[PDB]
Amino acid sequence: YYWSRYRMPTQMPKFDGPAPVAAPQSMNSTKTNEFIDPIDDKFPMSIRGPLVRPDVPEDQYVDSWYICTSMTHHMGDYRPWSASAPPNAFRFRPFNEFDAKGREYVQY
Amino acid sequence: ANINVVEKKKVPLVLAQMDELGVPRTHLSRVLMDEVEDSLRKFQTYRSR
Amino acid sequence: QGAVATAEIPAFFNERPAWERPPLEETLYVTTNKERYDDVRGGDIYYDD
Amino acid sequence: AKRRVIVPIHPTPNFPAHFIKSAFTTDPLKEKQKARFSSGGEAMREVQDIPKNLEGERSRRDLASRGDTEFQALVEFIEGASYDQLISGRRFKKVYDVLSENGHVMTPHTTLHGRRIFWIPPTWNRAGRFLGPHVTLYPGMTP
Amino acid sequence: SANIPRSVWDPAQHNPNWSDSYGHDITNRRAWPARKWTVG
Amino acid sequence: MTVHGTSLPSTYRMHKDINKAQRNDRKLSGNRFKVLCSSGAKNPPSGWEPIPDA
Amino acid sequence: TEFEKRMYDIRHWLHRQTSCEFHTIYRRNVIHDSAVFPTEHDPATPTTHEHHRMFSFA
Amino acid sequence: DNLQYKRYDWQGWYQRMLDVHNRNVSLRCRICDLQRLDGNGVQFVDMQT
Amino acid sequence: SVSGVFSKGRGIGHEATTSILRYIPRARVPWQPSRFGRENLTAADMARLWSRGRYRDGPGNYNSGYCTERTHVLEENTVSIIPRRELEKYMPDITIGPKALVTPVSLMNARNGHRVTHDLLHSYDPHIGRLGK
Amino acid sequence: MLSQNVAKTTVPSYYMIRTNLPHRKPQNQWEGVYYYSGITKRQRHLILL
Amino acid sequence: LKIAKSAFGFYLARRGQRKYPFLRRPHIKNTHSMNPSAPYFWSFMTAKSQMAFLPEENYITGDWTGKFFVSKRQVYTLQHATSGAKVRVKSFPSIFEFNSPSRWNIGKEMNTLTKPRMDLIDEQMLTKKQRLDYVRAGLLPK
Amino acid sequence: QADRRTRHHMMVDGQINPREWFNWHPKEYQPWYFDRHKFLYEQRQYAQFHHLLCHQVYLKDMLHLMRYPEPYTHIIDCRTSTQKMHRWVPHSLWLPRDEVEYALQLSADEFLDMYGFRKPDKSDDVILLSHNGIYSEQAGWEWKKQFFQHVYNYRGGTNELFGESYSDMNVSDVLSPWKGPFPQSGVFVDKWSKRKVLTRTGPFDRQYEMQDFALPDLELEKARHPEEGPRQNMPFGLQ
Amino acid sequence: MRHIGQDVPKRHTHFVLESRLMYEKSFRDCWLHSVCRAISQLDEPLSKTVVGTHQKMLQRKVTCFQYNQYGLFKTPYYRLANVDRYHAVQGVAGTREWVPYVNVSYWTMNKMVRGGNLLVHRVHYTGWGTDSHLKKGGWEHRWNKVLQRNVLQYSRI
RNA sequence: UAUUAUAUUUAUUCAUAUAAUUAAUAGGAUAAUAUUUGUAGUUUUUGAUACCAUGAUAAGGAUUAUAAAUUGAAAGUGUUAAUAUCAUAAUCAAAAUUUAUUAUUUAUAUUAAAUAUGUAUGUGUAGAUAAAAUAAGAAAUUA
Lengths: 108, 49, 49, 143, 40, 54, 58, 49, 133, 49, 142, 239, 157
Ligand SMILES: [Mg+2]
Ligand SMILES: [Mg+2]
Hints:
The structure is cut from a larger assembly and holds 13 protein chains of 10 kinds.
Chain B: H1 11-20, H2 30-42
Chain F: H1 11-23, E1 33-37, H2 39-42
Chain H: H1 9-21
Chain K binds one RNA strand of 143 nucleotides through residues 1-14, 16-19, 23, 25-33, 35-37, 39-40, 43-49, 52, 71-73, 90-93, 109, 111, 116-118, 125-127, 129-130, 132-134, 136-137.
């Protein structure tokens, strides 16, 4: 069948047991997001920092289709900022002498 | 597959050169012209077709 | 594990190593891949007869 | 009463039994209730708190090869300062447990809009206008 | 010419400056220790 | 005809077909007989003695 | 022509859901015939704006 | 087109439509290369020309 | 008990072939064995069907000028047709005839392939405009 | 008869209506257009003779 | 739509009072087509140039049996008056006839001679509610 | 007007209605050809044996090998009953079909002792022979299963050679009209919609279609039907 | 017909097909129509060769020919109905109820985007977009830039 | 009680729909030869319709706040997938106001291309209503 393609190759994980630690469970009046992680948002911005995703040159991220979130165009691999620039590049920069605009008008 | 068949696809280029060079294509052995005609019908087609 | 992607690729990429599988299969075994007629609750809808 | 009728889905090569009883209900007074949660291998071990009973050679191999968990937890929390990870409140929570072992008119409707760690990220069926957590609408110029 | 160029398969034309696949990308994701000095 | 052996009805048509089969099995005669060309029913061939129903 | 051939043929192994165009700019000899397009004096009678109405082209 | 309009009854009219969308042929020459001695010894394009 | 659209119909193909050909079973489309197509319409019915389906221009429409009814009813009001001899008294007749409907071969490419300015599109292939023949 | 002549459709049901499973394969981008290059037995024979 | 005055009552939504781009409203309803102007008489709702030919619709184009009404963009010509032949136009409820011929019509399109929205109202095409609403606006007496 | 034959019914008389286009496994629509005029074992009902068939040897080859024998080509007579065999195919040898499975498992010596002639090596050409070409075929399958490289069956064999009309087995082309209900072994539940549906086993089987198909002569075919024409029980549009 | 054995759930989808044929008729009649218009309305002389009484005569001859062409498709495009190829929902083009590059109505665009069928990208509902050109001058500017790369970058010959 | 302000500004004459037939495939120059030029087997079915005939996305501010950061929400607004058993109602122009749900041009100069609105000057004047703390500029009466 054409549909023979859409079978499950592997046995899917069963639901054996209870809701996870600090699950959203709603009592008499509760405003509940299934979406927001209960434990990792409660954790202070001072400590964890404003980052939603790893701090990496953004070329590695893609704005997802159908999901409000970004993903990495190489699954899960990450290259640090240091790998975008030349070795020991001041403020990782193609060349250390000037900022982008400085480079433009020097060139002109 | 058998890769080296791609070579036959050179042929319609060579034939074109033979016309630029003034080598008449009808002096080619009957034999070779059979093999070439085959090679053609594999890779050559016109804008019409 | 779960499948992130799916591709149709020839079976000779991964096939059980010749020393693991029975000797010449084409010649000594008649194999047909066919579909169960009965309703299969779970498991595969095809089997090798 | 014009009572609505729903016809049962039977197990299918892509739609196994548990998926059906968990994602599909034939009684339509139970529609549009809310999300249910379940646990898998590790999150189940955390929630259920199954004490491991001692066992054969592997279990004593792993009683002797254990090392300091007081420390390992600490390390793993720290490691969130690595370039490729974030710092997690969960990792911290695990450390803590091991140490202590002995606008304002709209923020009903802005509930997704800060920098939000997600669990399940929202999807376009469920969220009309949200852009995602990484997004900056009013960017400043930075060198 | 040839459909697959000599440079690919002929060891006379071997390029000594090419490196294997695994090495560069392992070397790349390296984050060296940020506290190289006292004070900073 | 190349892929399947045969012409296939559209999905919609198939739905109405299957439904007729299901509901012809319990009740009869909530029905009507509507054709494109009526002569085939009004003068049927020389044979054709429809099986009586109850 | 061989390079051109490889190049036109990259369209068969392109990545998934990706397409391409081919721009060519080459050099070619043109030939100006002073025989077919001779350079002569302007006619003894000139041509007016009246030979240029709409449909004058036709 | 290699994608969608590659292979069926619409491949023809889509192809032709691209070809007609692409009819433009740009013809260039530098005025530099027009200033050369003509076969008659007179410069082919001089200042006034 | 029986509701038809058309009362009668006819066979596409003629006696010599059919009388013998019937002893060989032909496979009809499994989900709709009986086929009554526009080749099978009678002459009258074909005429009627062919008039309709062309918006305003087409002869079916009462006001196209090709209408054969002598009377037509707009909201309970009965309107009697103005004959063309009478229409012409104030509305001059400029009629070239059928040659006006066909451009030369020379223009076929300007016109995206057609010689014919009629209201329906005209195909030059055998099959699209095929009736039985 | 021919054992590669094989059902491409499922048994007709409401599962074709109530589900987003696709009714045909998506086109395969890298499969070439099928075209005719090849000769008959008769033709080969004619050439040899 | 609320009331179906035609078939389209079933297919179309009103969408409240909705704005369309300039001079494209889906349905061409020319309420203004008879809108008196002495000084603009020859330029208003008529041909932009007086050297234009009369439209298609003043001519018999093909072999006709006859027509019921002539189109409303047909222009009234001295022969319309003089010949004494039926000149009909499709207006609502049914048809408007030019019965009483005048030269003052000549050279204008029948769009312009036929008042689209009459000051006359049928009380019998109106619901009791609609009649109420027409009394509020001070149209119908009551 | 309408009735159980003409209307849409999932089930007619408590069994799945074969008349519905949607009551069949779609695979039944896939195109097939008529077999019946071909050699018995090529036909589709014997499909389990198809991998085994034998390369043919025609009458021409047979006469040629009568006049011009090859040393290591063996012509082996498979005729089973001695009561029916009155002549000797030249240069042949006798291994009756019934013994083959045993015979081919003897050592060279033992085989020599039981059949009185040398056992063909597995390289040599072995041509098999029978009355109709049926037993020779089955024997062929035996010889092929021990792996003999050249095994040819001569169909039409002893009948064509000697002009005898005999048969190895009595099997007739006509199938007995199907007796019971439709076998539950052919009923095919669907995997997606869990819907029970017919297959072409049983009372519905292609054999029955080919068997009752129109004869290939106009006169004999017109004899089969009443004066007015071939199918008059049906409404015009089903004819 | 007469709602017997209809294949599609919405009957009106057929109208969409009718529409296609309208555009086809226009391709067949546009050049012709416009030439007859231009030659008809021309007040200046046509040319050096055709002037005066000949020109007047030829003008009338042409518009007479153009009026004689029965079924010639003269209807302006903005007066043709836009109707969905999917659900046969209609919308006025140039309005927020019609979506131009997919040529579907708002209703279908919504349905198709939310259950993923179209591949688009969501952008903040309130601005101009990701696009530079739209960001500069809005709809009119982008409209212009499209004109510029279709036409003006060519110096025609 | 600390983690900090509603009493400011600007608005309110709001209308627009029409002239019935949805049911199938069929390839052409530069190809080793098909008139397959011109491929001809009426008639047993019935729902999306003008009509009962389940599903699904709107709008609707009321307390997770400032830092490297969005002032728009799930509780569902015509068109979408299992209940059928009155009927062809669909734009391809030029057309007939009763509909809660709409920011119009207000006094030097005023109808040229698709045909394009003739009406209400009345002391910025009842009742009743609308909108905004966001590259703008407003500051003191919580549960
Ligand atoms: Mg709803
Ligand atoms: Mg219609």
